[PDB]
Amino acid sequence: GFKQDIATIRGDLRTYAQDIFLAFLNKYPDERRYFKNYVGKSDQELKSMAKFGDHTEKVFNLMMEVADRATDCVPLASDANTLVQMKQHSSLTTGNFEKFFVALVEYMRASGQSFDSQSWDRFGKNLVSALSSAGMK
Numbered sequence: 001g002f003k004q005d006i007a008t009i010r011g012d013l014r015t016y017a018q019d020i021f022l023a024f025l026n027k028y029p030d031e032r033r034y035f036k037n038y039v040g041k042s043d044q045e046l047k048s049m050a051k052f053g054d055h056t057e058k059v060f061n062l063m064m065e066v067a068d069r070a071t072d073c074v075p076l077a078s079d080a081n082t083l084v085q086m087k088q089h090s091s092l093t094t095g096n097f098e099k100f101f102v103a104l105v106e107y108m109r110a111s112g113q114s115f116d117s118q119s120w121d122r123f124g125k126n127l128v129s130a131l132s133s134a135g136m137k
């Protein structure tokens, strides 16, 4: 279930973080413009940049802590507010996060592993709800 999926991802956070982030950018290439240093870079060039690895690891570590603090896939309002108030997210809208979650759930369904994809979809929906309540446009 969702708890085990958190353990799966955390066990190999590097690999899942890089693979899901790349899935997101591949599915929604226009999103790459927010990441000015990843423009024009192959997947291996990205994996060569210590800074890409560090970014993805920190994003997915935070995502897993938010997921783990959720109850029944309902995140804490305080965690949504962290995400809204981060300077790195200041021009984003909830549609950016929706797309992130569509890509993550599609990755899980395509992986041929037994992720609880329905629960990640619901967590994403509830997180998007919470982001909007905490002031994201």
Ligand code: HEM
Pocket: 031, 034, 035, 036, 037, 054, 055, 058, 059, 060, 062, 063, 083, 088, 089, 092, 096, 097, 100
């Ligand atoms: C729930 C999903 C997300 C989480 C948990 C998250 C978390 C984070 C964290 C922890 C950082 C800072 C990492 C560091 O200091 O190395 C970060 C940076 C950033 N995030 Fe997010 N983020 C999420 C979704 C998004 C989305 C959807 C976008 C845009 C489409 C985005 C754009 C950025 C940008 C541009 C940075 C700064 C990147 C850089 O330094 O090159 N984030 N995010």
